[PDB]
Amino acid sequence: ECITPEAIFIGANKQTQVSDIHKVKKIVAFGAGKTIALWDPIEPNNKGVYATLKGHEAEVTCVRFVPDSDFMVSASEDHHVKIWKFTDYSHLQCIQTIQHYSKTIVALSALPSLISVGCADGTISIWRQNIQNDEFGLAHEFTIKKGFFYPLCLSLSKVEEKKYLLAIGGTNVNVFIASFILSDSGIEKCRVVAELEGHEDWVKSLAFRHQETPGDYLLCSGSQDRYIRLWRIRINDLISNKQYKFQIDDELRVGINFEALIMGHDDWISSLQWHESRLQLLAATADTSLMVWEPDETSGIWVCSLRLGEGGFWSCLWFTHERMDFFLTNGKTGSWRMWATKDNIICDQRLGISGATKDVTDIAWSPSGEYLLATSLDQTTRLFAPWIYDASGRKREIATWHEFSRPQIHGYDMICVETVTDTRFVSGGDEKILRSFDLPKGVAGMLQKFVGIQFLECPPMEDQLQRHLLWPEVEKLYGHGFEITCLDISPDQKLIASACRSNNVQNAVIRIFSTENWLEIKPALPFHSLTITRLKFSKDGKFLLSVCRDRKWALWERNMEDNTFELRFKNEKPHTRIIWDADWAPLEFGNVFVTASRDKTVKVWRHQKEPADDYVLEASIKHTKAVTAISIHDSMIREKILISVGLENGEIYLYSYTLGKFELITQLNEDITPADKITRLRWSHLKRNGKLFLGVGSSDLSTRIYSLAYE
């Protein structure tokens, strides 16, 4: 019936220009994979990322809000620049795609009706939007003819009406200042006027400050030489030592001069944010330092008034709310850290957002269905759960989801996870090893307090997730040099089934381990196939389903006394292409399993004793793209079964299936689905708040939660 995007967990890209914040709305927009994630940093219920803007075909690199407007500019490694416009108070849509560039866009800077673009081929362009429509047209572009120079940062400043400055920093030790004038349908008098020198390495961040005092404002530059330089700009009323004068025209005379030097002892300068209207400077560095610099009240020299954090920080943001001011910054794990201060004196850390930075490979709910696990190539296993209760046992108005634990942070290329119990899980990958972990005492009391799972003031901070909420490894299992591809637990939680793929010599094999003694049950299952893509124990544990890349499926009958297996059913032409995923249906529906294949079809297989004893094809359904994930809900909804279907391009479908007929409940709106391959779909056993819950992992970089309302 009704579908809600409950939660989106996606990590922030690691570039210095990826993030920005709307001055009026306080909405944080940052590049996250191919998408632009939107975060309300001060939502009353602590909601994290609530939407991801799709469109770019490669990693988003720059994001900037057009000041005093409803527009937003973004850039990507796809060489494109996109113009977005607000449709409601919180969401935007793409209105223009600039395909003028051949290499990655590196820097952006925006002012009302103006955009400054920097490309990795050396091009610097000025775009101003037409007045009739909202389309942005190329006004003029040029190049700094200094070898293979290309810009790494840009900053615009409106000096007077129709007259602008453009700061350029990149692969050069000098800050280039250009000046142009606004004219009918473009610009003129655009040339480089000054080369502010002083830095000793590449300039990585630039930012002009606004004119609180008419005609006298500041420009801060950050370099890879660990320093920040402050430059004073004046107009008409100007005067070692140096000062770079130039004329924007026969009636405007600018004078720039060095004013202050800061830091120099905390690695590269990652990001610099001025604050409106106070005269303070926020700086993020590459050694995980976030500092506020302001001129002393007595001596006037610049001095650090606040220090936060300690790796590295890439971007930082700054907004004021309720007489306090908030500091944002993203780290190596793609997580946003946040602080709040009455004043530069006191502060406390506020709840942030988190997510993977590389493709999400697998997910798995706990047997109870109260939390979700997800692994990523970013070498982390992450646990997400809803914040249902406050500290007093009262139920929160909205149960927003958060990462409550990071069981693993140093896992080499995991591609599969599965929960043994509510307190233990197993994980594997190309390590050629299978690791199992227990739920520690700390995480326990936290899930019990805020999530209600029975067995501080708010969910964890990034500090606690990186080195306190790790699960202790309890068991090492060796595949004897064979890479793992997937696994499953028997319903009784007494058996592991590990799928190991072929080394192009020996074929695939299924290894069975006991959860009690963690010893292999030695009759290993061989194959005439190379890569098993998914194993699944039947609901009653009687059979072990198998699907392979070479288009086959095979059912292994279980001996309930010896815990051994014997091939009983097989099919060598059930599908035309790779079978990516399979899942059983509730026994109350029958003896049924479903397959999903690269051949774009989902097929249902029901057991029949009639001639012959075998699982035969019952129904099929074709799609537009390859089907990569499928999940049947543990319970039955409206006397039928509920099937979620994930495609290679990110689309998700929800079906109700009865004997011989599929029924499209709905295709999830294109604005809430992932932007790439769904790697796993998993319903949650739990029914809560009259809602079913669906967990999704994708090459998006994201782990997403959806709800479905039935009764």
Author numbering: 3 to 241, 255 to 325, 339 to 483, 533 to 788
Paper text:
The highly conserved eukaryotic Elongator complex performs specific chemical modifications on wobble base uridines of tRNAs, which are essential for proteome stability and homeostasis. The complex is formed by six individual subunits (Elp1‐6) that are all equally important for its tRNA modification activity. The eukaryotic Elongator complex has been associated with a plethora of cellular activities 8, 9, 10, but nowadays, it is widely accepted that the main cellular function of the Elongator complex is the formation of 5‐methoxycarbonylmethyl‐uridine (mcm5U), 5‐methoxycarbonylmethyl‐2‐thio‐uridine (mcm5s2U), and 5‐carbamoylmethyl‐uridine (ncm5U) in the wobble base position of 11 eukaryotic tRNAs 10.
A difference map between the full Elp123 model and the asymmetric model rendered, apart from a minor difference in the bottom part, a bean‐shaped density. Our group also independently solved the yeast Elp2 structure at 2.8 Å resolution (Appendix Table S1 and Fig EV4F), which is highly similar (r.m.s.d. = 1.19 Å686Cα) to the previously published Elp2 structure 30. Elp2 is located peripherally attached to Elp1‐CTD and Elp3. In detail, the active site of Elp3 is located in the conserved cavity formed by Elp3, the N‐terminal WD40 domain of Elp2, and the α‐solenoid domain of Elp1‐CTD. The region of Elp2 contributing to the cavity includes residues 201–204, which were found to be important for tRNA modification activity of Elongator. Finally, to understand the contribution of individual conserved surface residues in Elp2, we mutated residues in the previously identified 30 basic region (R626, R628, R654, R675), which was described to be important for histone acetylation and microtubule binding. None of the tested mutations affects the stability of Elp2 and we therefore believe that these regions are involved in protein–protein interactions.
